[PDB]
Symmetry: C3
Subunit: 274 residues, 3 copies
């Protein structure tokens, strides 16, 4: 990790001086949710380029009455960021006073029961880069954030998932809310058929390229975490299919679901403990 403890403190102190807002919730907007900052009131925006130590914009504002800090644009391993840069904002959030992190992403559906446009609550994850030691916590532990060996078995808050199921029901959507396991791999290529079959056999329901390292750092520093995937495509599972994953369809799925995603997150603000 290239950052010192004091880097995170300096960045938090800088933000705290430059805004009077004091959010308890941070939201990292993945695909389909880039427009969520447009639902904020009393919005104050900082370009990442103007914030000390930041590797896009960070927006402080109020979402459905709740003070939030939002990343419009996140960082990815596939773009060449190390995980200690990808996750820098999460520790800054903790030092700002945030207590809950909401994460979202786009993902391919491995579970054959999913459909394009589904929302999948993340109940759990599989961190494939972590199996080989690629991990934002690699290196000396900063005890001022958390412990050397943090547990991940309770990462995705149970109460929030129950409340998300309730909220969804009250929104009266025809399509049910999905829930399952998100597997992170590095990307940026999409998977072969053989890779898709094995990922599904690992127990995964959705595959993507982000989120997990953010969650690990969030849990290490004691944040409550809730997340979901937008299912943008059903991954190709056989050789006979003329289907082929492509950015175009992912972008189009994101566009079609944007309103539903934003609405759902906005409504969920009410369920986050104060």
């Amino acid at each position: 990790n290239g950052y010192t403890y004091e880097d995170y403190q300096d960045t938090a102190k800088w933000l705290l001086s430059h805004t009077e807002q004091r959010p308890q919730v941070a939201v990292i907007c993945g695909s389909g949710l880039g427009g969520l900052v447009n639902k904020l009131t009393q919005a104050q925006t900082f370009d990442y380029s103007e914030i000390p130590n930041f590797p896009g914009r960070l927006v402080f504002g109020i979402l459905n009455g709740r003070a939030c800090v939002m990343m419009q644009g996140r960082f990815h391993m596939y773009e060449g960021y190390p995980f200690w840069k990808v996750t820098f904002p999460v520790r800054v959030f903790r030092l700002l006073g945030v207590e809950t992190l909401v994460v979202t992403n786009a993902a391919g559906g491995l579970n054959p029961n999913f459909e394009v446009g589904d929302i999948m609550l993340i109940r759990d994850h599989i961190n494939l880069p972590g199996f080989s030691g690629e991990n934002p916590l690699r290196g000396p532990n900063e005890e001022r954030f958390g412990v050397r060996f943090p547990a991940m078995s309770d990462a995705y808050d149970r109460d929030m998932r129950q409340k998300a199921h309730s909220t969804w029901k009250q929104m009266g959507e025809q399509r049910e809310l999905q829930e399952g396991t998100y597997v992170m791999l590095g990307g940026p290529n999409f998977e072969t058929v053989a890779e898709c079959r094995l990922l599904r056999n690992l127990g995964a329901d959705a595959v993507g390229m982000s989120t997990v390292p953010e969650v690990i750092v969030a849990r290490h520093c004691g944040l409550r975490v809730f997340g979901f995937s937008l299912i943008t495509n059903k991954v190709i599972m056989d050789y006979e299919s003329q289907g082929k994953a492509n950015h175009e369809e992912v972008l189009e799925a994101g566009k079609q679901a944007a309103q539903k995603l934003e609405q759902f997150v906005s409504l969920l603000m009410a369920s986050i403990p104060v």
Copy 2:
């Protein structure tokens, strides 16, 4: 990636000035195929050491009436190369005007139906280093080569595999041509029993230490790809076996198969699209 687009251009230009050959086919010769360059007519040879930006020798020549460029010797992750070095030649090939890449390798047989000396057409792959983000495409995307998120589900050209089956028949070899999934891992050690069992349970038929990153880059830049593995050993699947994988047996299998592999590739030239 330490190379700029202009680095690839410089190397392509250097080669195009040093030879008047204009190949449509590139062959990366894996174990057992090192002698293929000796079958070329009107061969012109360049040591890797002399070629600008190259991390063996590169040979331009005619094989069975088709103009080829051929890597005698390739680069491996286990020798300490990053994938952006391993795959440098593939993008150069595209800039030379190559349209089809033939790749080969040696591999251990995970499928118990394989025998030493079998050729396995590669129908698909599993990229284990890519699960952790070790990927030649990591970093900012070069759009002059291809898209940010390239698909891999159709990587191994279906027509070529059909024509390879037909070509093998024409050869009257008594051993059938195999076809299956190659899994790449870093190496250089051979697998434990527990590792072999889990790799077979992932759906892999053969295990090796190369090829996949070159295929990813090839597909990203639009090349047609055909590949195969020489099965040099049946991997050890139980603790009771007195068998043990060893380089000597791998070298011996390559020697015994060399003529058949060279003949197969030569004959396959007639089936590569023009």
Copy 3:
């Protein structure tokens, strides 16, 4: 790898000139075995800071009559060491004249038949970082240590494991000695439920964060290898459990087991070929 053959040689020379002891056994003490040096007679201690090229202390002394060199403190990937630093001592031991390496660790129990406090003999391993090329042998091969492609299928000496079972039975312990496959991942976080389930389905019995690199380098240089894990916790396998892995209970389990682990290793010395 930052070390040349001469660096290892220099380090070995230096140790050989600074002690008269000529150990044939090396012990890398994992969790629970830190106190084993206290059972050494005629002990001479070198701080790692004293030894040329070393990335804790190295203790030469006599264990149950048998000359040993023991690492009190090993190096871990999760603390930011590359595997070429983690495994540096193993090659030094070979150049000292060591013929047998004993390794130990703490691990989480994936096999539901295990209980906290169990000792699991390592019959085999799964090297997940090695699947992505994170391997202490990556780079140019040094033939003076071993071959380019060393086999791992016979890594854990069969005779030593049989003798360990006999020793345990003669100790009269009522809990049986376990035996199985250890899977290494990077850490330092503990696993999610989904990860635990998939690792069990890979065929692993215990999961930890060390050892495997040391074993690969040991086998590459021809050392006999024996190892075990102390099972410090039963990994969480379902979402209904209120359990949660924690360092406090791992430390406590090691503390409780220490006197027995030290006794077991001490008695096992008699079973090493002389």
